[PDB]
Amino acid sequence: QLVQSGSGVKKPGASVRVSCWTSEDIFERTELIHWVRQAPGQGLEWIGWVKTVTGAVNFGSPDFRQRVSLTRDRDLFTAHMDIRGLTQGDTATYFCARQKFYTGGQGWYFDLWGRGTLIVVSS
Amino acid sequence: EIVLTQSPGTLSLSPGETASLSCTAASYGHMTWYQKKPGQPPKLLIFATSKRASGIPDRFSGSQFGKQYTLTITRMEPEDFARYYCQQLEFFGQGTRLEIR
Amino acid sequence: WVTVYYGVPVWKEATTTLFCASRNVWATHACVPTDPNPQEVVLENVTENFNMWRNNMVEQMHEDIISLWDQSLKPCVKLTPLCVTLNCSDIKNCSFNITTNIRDKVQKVYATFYKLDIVPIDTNYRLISCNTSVLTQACPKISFEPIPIHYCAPAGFAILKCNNKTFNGKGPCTNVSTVQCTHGIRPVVSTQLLLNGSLAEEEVVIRSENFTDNAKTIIVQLNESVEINCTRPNNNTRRSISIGPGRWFYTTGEIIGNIRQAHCNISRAKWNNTLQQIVNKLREKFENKTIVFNQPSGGDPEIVMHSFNCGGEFFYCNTTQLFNSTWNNTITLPCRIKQIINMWQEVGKAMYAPPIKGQIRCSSNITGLLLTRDGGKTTNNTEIFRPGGGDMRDNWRSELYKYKVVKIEPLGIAPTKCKRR
Amino acid sequence: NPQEVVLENVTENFNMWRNNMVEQMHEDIISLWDQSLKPCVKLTPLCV
Amino acid sequence: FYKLDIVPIDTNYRLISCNTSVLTQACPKISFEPIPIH
Amino acid sequence: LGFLGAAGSTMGAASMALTVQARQLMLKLTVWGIKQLQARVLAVERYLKDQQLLGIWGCSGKLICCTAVPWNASWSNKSVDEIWGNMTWMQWEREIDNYTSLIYTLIEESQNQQEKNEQELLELD
Amino acid sequence: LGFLGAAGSTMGAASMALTVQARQLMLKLTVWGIKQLQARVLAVERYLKDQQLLGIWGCSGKLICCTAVPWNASWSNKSVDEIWGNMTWMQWEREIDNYTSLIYTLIEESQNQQEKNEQELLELD
Amino acid sequence: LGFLGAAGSTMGAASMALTVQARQLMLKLTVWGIKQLQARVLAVERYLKDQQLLGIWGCSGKLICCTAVPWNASWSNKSVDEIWGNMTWMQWEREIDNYTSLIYTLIEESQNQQEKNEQELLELD
Ligand SMILES: *[C@@H]1O[C@H](CO)[C@@H](O[C@@H]2O[C@H](CO)[C@@H](O[C@@H]3O[C@H](CO[C@H]4O[C@H](CO)[C@@H](O)[C@H](O)[C@@H]4O)[C@@H](O)[C@H](O[C@H]4O[C@H](CO)[C@@H](O)[C@H](O)[C@@H]4O[C@H]4O[C@H](CO)[C@@H](O)[C@H](O)[C@@H]4O)[C@@H]3O)[C@H](O)[C@H]2NC(C)=O)[C@H](O)[C@H]1NC(C)=O
Ligand SMILES: *[C@@H]1O[C@H](CO)[C@@H](O[C@@H]2O[C@H](CO)[C@@H](O[C@@H]3O[C@H](CO[C@H]4O[C@H](CO)[C@@H](O)[C@H](O[C@H]5O[C@H](CO)[C@@H](O)[C@H](O)[C@@H]5O)[C@@H]4O)[C@@H](O)[C@H](O[C@H]4O[C@H](CO)[C@@H](O)[C@H](O)[C@@H]4O)[C@@H]3O)[C@H](O)[C@H]2NC(C)=O)[C@H](O)[C@H]1NC(C)=O
Ligand SMILES: *[C@@H]1O[C@H](CO)[C@@H](O[C@@H]2O[C@H](CO)[C@@H](O[C@@H]3O[C@H](CO[C@H]4O[C@H](CO)[C@@H](O)[C@H](O)[C@@H]4O)[C@@H](O)[C@H](O[C@H]4O[C@H](CO)[C@@H](O)[C@H](O)[C@@H]4O)[C@@H]3O)[C@H](O)[C@H]2NC(C)=O)[C@H](O)[C@H]1NC(C)=O
Ligand SMILES: *[C@@H]1O[C@H](CO)[C@@H](O[C@@H]2O[C@H](CO)[C@@H](O)[C@H](O)[C@H]2NC(C)=O)[C@H](O)[C@H]1NC(C)=O
Ligand SMILES: *[C@@H]1O[C@H](CO)[C@@H](O[C@@H]2O[C@H](CO)[C@@H](O)[C@H](O)[C@H]2NC(C)=O)[C@H](O)[C@H]1NC(C)=O
Ligand SMILES: *[C@@H]1O[C@H](CO)[C@@H](O[C@@H]2O[C@H](CO)[C@@H](O)[C@H](O)[C@H]2NC(C)=O)[C@H](O)[C@H]1NC(C)=O
Ligand SMILES: *[C@@H]1O[C@H](CO)[C@@H](O)[C@H](O)[C@H]1NC(C)=O
Ligand SMILES: *[C@@H]1O[C@H](CO)[C@@H](O)[C@H](O)[C@H]1NC(C)=O
Ligand SMILES: *[C@@H]1O[C@H](CO)[C@@H](O)[C@H](O)[C@H]1NC(C)=O
Ligand SMILES: *[C@@H]1O[C@H](CO)[C@@H](O)[C@H](O)[C@H]1NC(C)=O
Ligand SMILES: *[C@@H]1O[C@H](CO)[C@@H](O)[C@H](O)[C@H]1NC(C)=O
Ligand SMILES: *[C@@H]1O[C@H](CO)[C@@H](O)[C@H](O)[C@H]1NC(C)=O
Ligand SMILES: *[C@@H]1O[C@H](CO)[C@@H](O)[C@H](O)[C@H]1NC(C)=O
Ligand SMILES: *[C@@H]1O[C@H](CO)[C@@H](O)[C@H](O)[C@H]1NC(C)=O
Ligand SMILES: *[C@@H]1O[C@H](CO)[C@@H](O)[C@H](O)[C@H]1NC(C)=O
Ligand SMILES: *[C@@H]1O[C@H](CO)[C@@H](O)[C@H](O)[C@H]1NC(C)=O
């Protein structure tokens, strides 16, 4: 599950709109949609999250807070990541994943992950 | 960063043996573990330190030792020679990998 | 030997349907078991486990409020006939072609809309709520003024209240009082700041389901209120456009005076003192470091702006002058007015608030805040907090944090040395 | 059947203009009248 | 229509109940004969 | 003591308040009306289940109803003075998990035999 | 015997099971919710009518309540052994159609006179 | 006398009719159905409040329940013959406004002490 936008190549300075979506049954049981990055040869880096109910967001670092806009669409059961100012250092596979409603203290854990959109930034 | 250091980096194991994967935190929140293969999204194995995700066999388990959290993979199958990562809320560790001896 | 006693002071944790005691949108004429007086029975040496985040009373309050809200609008005017292309100039003054009472003639009529209520079609505009929901006008006779209600247990149930004062919202409480009904709680709808409700007894108390989990809302309960003066200065007039057989649309007619921005006035010193106490407590909850307050990054209104229901108008206020501050004479916050409101995060429904004819002036009490943490690795010795969360159950969770519902089980067995004749 | 129990030496104060039974009869009749028409045909299309 | 049910618009008529109320036709199966209740 | 008188700490400390607690046991399709009707029905249904049960154990009194049933196991191996002293009623109940639905070791059978015996004696003597 | 213990065939065969039977006596405007609420109210209303009636005959016991009322006609002209033997409770009831609502030959009058007499004696002695 | 037997005029004139009165105490969302359901619930709730109250005063009888409570003030300064004669029950009640909720001068306390005393004697003798 979690259908995603396909891969592509951008020139430095370009923006990209990455999206993902699901069924009503899954979206309605999701508290947060998280975005996770994996650059080639690297481990996983958390980018941020969007609450599915209120639209509130959070980020991994200022390097994302000032460039990446994360939104949700509660009528369409989708989520988006708009990355502005792309650089070569942003080449990575970008995954969306969901966090089911959970109580505090259980930690974060994502049962369902999308396949990953590959974004390459190159001259 | 000083949180979620993982070890051993690479574990050379025979099929049927037991992997021991450690992740050390700077704080105490419950640990989460994932399995990954190239070309695939990671799969959730363990969460809330010791609980397992649906679809996960009893080969996979874990526990807490103060700030050290561990993942045990026993009776290892060929399908388990994958990359593994620990997560603690917003942070991921470097990850470790299992390989065939 | 085996002896049975009836009426023993024993209870179990349990849920049950609660009823309330006390034209309004929350009815209040049906919620008329009428409140007598509290009994406040203090239980010597009784401890209990409270958890504000697993409180079934919060879930019921949320369900009651939404079902009442919708029930009260059930007979009100639908605005379906307004989803036509609008010809808009300049807040915009828009005209459109609407079928009149005799359905073979069409009138050209005029109404204003606030910019936030309309979207370009690509001077060609449509109401924003024409493709996602059915827009209903609230009836002009319905008051939206919060009236406190008290939640009351059924006869076989009781409510235990925690009197610890500095209780963190979770765990054992060693001073427990038994009541039949809760204190009155006003069903105030707001975001970012908590308005009215009730203040902490001694100190500002910061509660969180888990302080290290940045996905959870931090609820700040103040021990002193801050009074806020909110005004919508324009001198309005109300216009009525027939849209049917005994049905009409209430809109805003010509503005009598000059156009002025809506705004809220907060004392600077009061706000600074409020923050010093919050900062002191955050310093205690985390690990020294500095505290930085900053602006929300969600971009859009509703998510990043403070909202009020003031006289029936809906205000969105740009509360950045309250949070752009680093910690180791008045402030005027501009506000925008919006008429199409998705109150509660519902899908398929929307409300149109009729305009109010006069000048509006409100005075509200800030009694708390909803803050979230900026995640990521800290690169200095500082933590950043922003207004956030926005889940309405957090407002009600704060007011109900002191209560637990239990079931009385009066029958039981205890030993003796007795046998019936 | 009615029971008609006559009460010896019992007096009472009656007031037909403060009779709650009248108010209930009025309320029952109007709510029934409207309930019975709830599923019936609307004539909106005739306002031409 | 009976004259009492219509009003001139100013041979151009409208039903009287088009500007003040929503007109509903009573269902033909409903009897209006009073039946006593106790 | 007030409504509960909880934790009187000698078990019988609040025994004389048992009746304080025992005593505590228009609108159309509007939300509050529906909820109140269900709450009223629930209070009645629960009240009657307790009275019905006491009614087959030969109990109608409220403070104390002595039975003819012995302890067939220690259940909680404490003397009377260790229970009826230094203890909250709730703690006493908390001590027994396994003699709960099983505490009622056919109390009703003892009651039925007693009623049968009384009838036989009334017919015979 | 289980819930009914029907046709124990000596009438009193299932008398010791009388209490088994005696003991057996969210949701909005959804169809099932409405029906359940009416069913709950009905169970209560019926339960109370039986208790109310026993309550004026001087009965609170359940298995057997002896009265002070004689048979003023044969009703069913059989000896006790012809009833309490070779018979199902239902057959016994089936035998009497004409002493049904008329079986209660002022049981309540006998009860009222007894209560009045007890009060007079308590005041006088 | 019929259902009420009101104004029998000697107070006790209709005492033997007390049980006549005591005894008197599909459909969807249609108007009449809703009203009937509320009426049925009300009858039950009220019936039980009276039984519950009698139940803590040690009363289960209906015509007369003698207590152990004295008159601590004249209340209505009349002899028994001035009340139980030349008077309607309602007139008797009409005479006392200030010993109404206060008439129940801890009847229930007297009842609780009696039940406690009975238990102590059963354990001791
Ligand atoms: C019911 O009706 C509503 C109202 O129309 C509708 O919601 C609207 O949905 C559309 C998307 O379909 C939204 O349009 C996008 O808006 C962003 C806005 O960014 C600015 O404003 C925000 C405000 O918060 C600022 O934070 C931000 O910094 C900006 O200033 C635009 O950026 C989007 O542009 C892209 O998508 C367009 C799609 O039409 C393209 O035309 C456009 O060129 C951009 O994508 C293309 O170019 C990119 C390179 O630049 C490239 O990388 C991409 O791959 C691609 O080729 C876009 O205009 C609109 O804002 C929503 N309106 C409101 C009021 O919310 C609901 O969806 C509809 N409902 C249902 C249930 O069906
Ligand atoms: C937190 O809690 C505070 C209260 O503690 C909330 O603030 C109050 O909000 C309500 C609703 O918005 C305000 O009521 C409205 O007030 C306006 C203005 O009133 C003035 O002008 C009137 C002109 O006609 C005049 O009548 C008023 O006189 C009052 O006082 C006299 C006695 O001196 C009394 O006799 C009157 O009856 C009035 O009480 C006053 O000079 C008023 O126009 C509004 O009327 C509309 O609504 C009512 C129904 O409510 C309807 O009947 C009217 O026809 C009309 O449609 C309404 O009364 C109240 O004034 C605010 N209190 C203060 C101190 O400012 C606050 O909103 C809460 N916050 C949140 C977030 O919930
Ligand atoms: C957000 O949510 C997280 C969970 O995700 C909460 O974290 C837990 O917090 C508690 C309280 O601080 C921690 O409790 C401690 O556990 C230690 C366990 O280690 C022993 O036991 C394990 C068995 O599994 C052994 O393997 C190990 O070798 C040890 O023998 C205890 O040692 C600690 O003891 C200290 O406190 C006790 C009092 O209870 C004293 O008596 C001791 O002497 C000593 O001082 C302690 O009990 C818990 O470990 C944390 N993590 C987890 C995963 O459970 C956060 O607290 C929560 N945040 C907020 C704000 O609420
Ligand atoms: C436990 O709670 C009680 C109830 O609030 C506190 O005692 C007093 O209660 C009365 C109401 O009956 C209030 O009017 C008083 O103001 C309360 N006293 C005080 C000092 O606030 C009792 O003090 C609390 N226990 C502890 C340890 O604080
Ligand atoms: C929107 O603009 C129109 C004009 O384009 C305004 O129309 C006037 O309406 C008043 C009655 O309120 C008439 O007396 C004037 O003669 C109209 N003017 C013209 C040129 O026809 C309309 O009122 C404006 N609407 C609002 C809400 O401001
Ligand atoms: C709240 O007010 C601030 C100004 O105090 C707005 O910030 C400005 O936004 C524009 C457009 O992005 C920038 O060009 C300015 O430089 C910003 N000013 C400052 C001082 O940073 C902010 O956008 C307003 N927020 C809302 C929701 O209306
Ligand atoms: C709006 O009205 C003006 C006349 O005031 C007219 O010229 C213009 O074409 C109209 N625009 C639309 C979209 O109807
Ligand atoms: C209203 O109808 C007229 C035709 O009678 C048309 O010319 C005009 O453009 C229409 N206006 C709008 C706003 O649709
Ligand atoms: C509340 O609990 C804290 C311990 O968490 C304790 O120090 C404080 O004295 C308690 N307050 C009251 C009123 O008992
Ligand atoms: C606001 O606080 C003041 C005390 O500072 C109090 O007198 C006033 O009634 C409060 N208003 C509300 C709405 O709670
Ligand atoms: C805010 O203060 C200014 C003066 O600095 C005043 O003109 C304005 O009317 C005040 N607004 C409110 C809502 O009190
Ligand atoms: C303009 O505002 C004043 C109050 O300041 C009010 O009395 C007056 O009626 C308003 N004018 C109109 C036309 O409504
Ligand atoms: C935290 O601050 C307090 C003063 O409020 C100080 O006593 C304590 O030593 C500080 N802790 C650390 C780790 O700096
Ligand atoms: C935040 O405060 C700084 C001064 O510390 C000021 O320069 C900046 O413009 C302020 N930003 C906003 C949005 O008010
Ligand atoms: C403005 O604030 C003051 C307190 O500083 C308050 O007394 C006054 O009533 C407020 N104005 C309005 C319209 O509420
Ligand atoms: C963190 O420290 C660096 C210097 O090493 C400084 O440039 C930066 O502004 C500081 N960040 C904050 C949030 O204070």
Numbering used by the authors:
A (entry chain H): 3 to 35, 35A, 36 to 52, 52A, 52B, 53 to 82, 82A, 82B, ...
B (entry chain L): 1 to 27, 30 to 91, 96 to 107
C (entry chain A): 35 to 56, 66 to 133, 154 to 185, 189 to 309, 312 to 321, 321A, 322 to 355, 357 to 396, ...
D (entry chain C): 80 to 127
E (entry chain C): 176 to 185, 189 to 216
F (entry chain B), G (entry chain I), H (entry chain D): 520 to 544, 565 to 664
Task: Show me the paper's own sentences about this structure.
The human immunodeficiency virus type 1 (HIV-1) trimeric envelope glycoprotein (Env) is located on the surface of virus particles and is the target of neutralizing antibodies (NAbs), which are produced during infection. The assembled Env trimer consists of three heterodimers, each formed by a gp41 and gp120 subunit. The trimer contains around 90 potential N-linked glycosylation sites (PNGS), which account for approximately half of the molecular mass of the external domains of the Env trimer. The densely packed glycans on the trimer surface shield the underlying peptidic surface from recognition by the immune system.
We also describe here a new SOSIP trimer, AMC016 SOSIP.v4.2, as well as high-resolution cryo-EM structures for the AMC16 and AMC018 trimers, adding to the repertoire of stable and native-like Env subtype B trimers. The Cα root-mean-square deviation (RMSD) value, a quantitative measure for similarity between superimposed structures, was 1.1 Å for AMC016 versus BG505 in the gp120 subunit and 1.3 Å in the gp41 subunit, while the RMSD values for AMC018 versus BG505 were 1.0 Å in gp120 and 1.5 Å in gp41. The electron density for the AMC016 structure was sufficient to allow the building of 26 glycans out of 30 PNGS (glycans indicated in green), while we were able to build 16 glycans on the AMC018 structure out of 30 PNGS (glycans indicated in green). As the overall resolution increases, electron density corresponding to dynamic or flexible regions (e.g., uncoordinated N-linked glycans) becomes more diffuse, which prevents accurate model building of those regions. Thus, although the resolution of the AMC018 trimer structure was higher than that of the AMC016 trimer structure, the reduced electron density corresponding to PNGS in the AMC018 structure reduced the number of glycans that could be built. The AMC016 and AMC18 viruses were categorized as tier 2. The corresponding AMC016 and AMC018 trimers were then tested as immunogens, as were the previously described DU422, CZA97.012, and TRJO trimers. In both studies, rabbits (n = 5) were immunized at week 0, 4 and 20, with Iscomatrix used as the adjuvant. The median autologous NAb ID50 values measured at week 22 were 30, 39, 42, 401, and 719 for AMC016, AMC018, DU422, CZA97.012, and TRJO, respectively. The areas were relatively small (<200 Å2) for AMC011, AMC009, DU422, and ZM197M (33, 170, 156, and 156 Å2); intermediate (<200 to 1,000 Å2) for AMC016, TRJO, and AMC018 (218, 286, and 803 Å2); and large (>1,000 Å2) for AMC008, B41, CZA97.012, and BG505 (1,120, 1,641, 1,671, and 2,401 Å2).
